Ligand binder design. Structure first.
Ligand SMILES: CN(C)[C@@H]1C(O)=C(C(N)=O)C(=O)[C@@]2(O)C(O)=C3C(=O)c4c(O)ccc(I)c4C[C@H]3C[C@@H]12
Ligand SMILES: CN(C)[C@@H]1C(O)=C(C(N)=O)C(=O)[C@@]2(O)C(O)=C3C(=O)c4c(O)ccc(I)c4C[C@H]3C[C@@H]12
Ligand SMILES: [Cl-]
Ligand SMILES: [Cl-]
Ligand SMILES: [Mg+2]
Ligand SMILES: [Mg+2]
Lengths: 207, 207
């Protein structure tokens, strides 16, 4: 096996889709690369180092709407950015789980700084811009986590035995699983954005 | 050790706060109860069975705003219910993680049915009521997950070495960690609720 950074992460990503985040072991990574663990240890000191790098690479490779277009409204950038973040989290098994608990990396500083600055130039205080970004981020992670983990868990349950399901819930779940949760996410996303807009344009009035 | 259902779950909860969800093993649970694994196996067939029961018990014990008060508005119930859900997720280590991927349990059917019905009697279609509930749920899980996992991870990082932190981000993170993320959550929560309200009261008008 070739053992530069890009080769290690490629292989770690393959493994993540075979085994999930819980089977992403240094031991199994070494098997994958056909090397002995101490060779691996020279390049990758532990699982956390690895999870952090993966979190960053996942977005670097598949998160393509991280900056606003020229003249694009804040409402639009936030929608496009959340969509882009979702596709990215979703391209790998337990990908949301891999992002969880990370904070921005040095390679991401410039990008996140621009996002923050961009909100502030649209009339958000830093505090409110921070909250809008966080809310979008938290909402999108939760939706993707519930979706991916429910699909993981699907294999180990007796699965909604119905009959004794009451009527609304019964119809609710049929609807929730009509699709991957995209409609639900997209509808919620609009609610969030609109809600921030009425806050912004309230200024110092009571809303 | 006493080995009824309530004793097993009590002990599993103690363990969850000592070891986290990843160290919640049947092996370690048996140690905790001072019994041999086959004795445990008679009562608790595996980790998933256990995680499911825990998810339900956590809410049964600490989620006290699961139904609307008499005459309470939908906006109010959703705020109170999300707050109540958050405190609950947060009372145990990796408690959000334990909830993840669960779906409503038989013991919860009646409660969730009422929530659904209640939205529909306030003018939501089932579909829109479902989305509002889901959005609140997903948002609250994400916020709590990021908070709990960042705190877990805190122990294993070199921790924001600053200096080369750019100014807005730098001030952003000071703000994000001024508190446990409560302000951010509460502010986002209002945005979500208000956004649903403008949707509701749009009816068939363009908004
Ligand atoms: C989802 N989208 C709003 C953002 C985004 O586009 C990026 C990215 N890398 O391009 C991200 O890194 C992002 O997904 C993301 O992960 C973010 C955070 O993790 C984060 C944080 O944890 C604490 C403070 C701040 I301040 C942030 C910035 C947030 C920005 C998030
Ligand atoms: C957070 N709050 C809106 C709700 C709640 O009060 C309860 C509860 N048990 O009282 C819950 O169980 C809840 O937390 C919760 O966990 C829910 C779900 O998991 C859920 C779902 O996964 C798929 C369809 C539906 I339809 C639901 C109902 C949602 C209701 C959520
Ligand atoms: Cl090499
Ligand atoms: Cl007993
Ligand atoms: Mg993040
Ligand atoms: Mg749930």
């Amino acid at each position: 096996a070739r053992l530069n950074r890009e080769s290690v992460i490629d292989a770690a990503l393959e493994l993540l889709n075979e085994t999930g985040i819980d089977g992403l072991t240094t031991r199994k990574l070494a098997q994958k690369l056909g090397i002995e663990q101490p060779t691996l240890y020279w390049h990758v000191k532990n699982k956390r180092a690895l999870l952090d790098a993966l979190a960053v690479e996942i977005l670097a490779r598949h998160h393509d709407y991280s900056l606003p277009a020229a003249g694009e409204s804040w409402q639009s950038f936030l929608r496009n950015n959340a969509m882009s973040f979702r596709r990215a989290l979703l391209r790998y098994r337990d990908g949301a789980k891999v992002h969880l608990g990370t904070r921005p990396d040095e390679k991401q500083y410039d990008t996140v700084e621009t996002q923050l600055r961009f909100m502030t130039e649209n009339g958000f205080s830093l505090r409110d811009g921070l909250y809008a970004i966080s809310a979008v981020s938290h909402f999108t992670l939760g939706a993707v986590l519930e979706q991916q983990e429910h699909t993981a868990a699907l294999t180990d349950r007796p699965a909604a035995p119905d009959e004794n399901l009451p009527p609304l819930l019964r119809e609710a779940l049929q609807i929730m699983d009509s699709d991957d949760g995209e409609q639900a996410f997209l509808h919620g996303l609009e609610s969030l954005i609109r809600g921030f807009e009425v806050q912004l344009t309230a200024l110092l009035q009571i809303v």
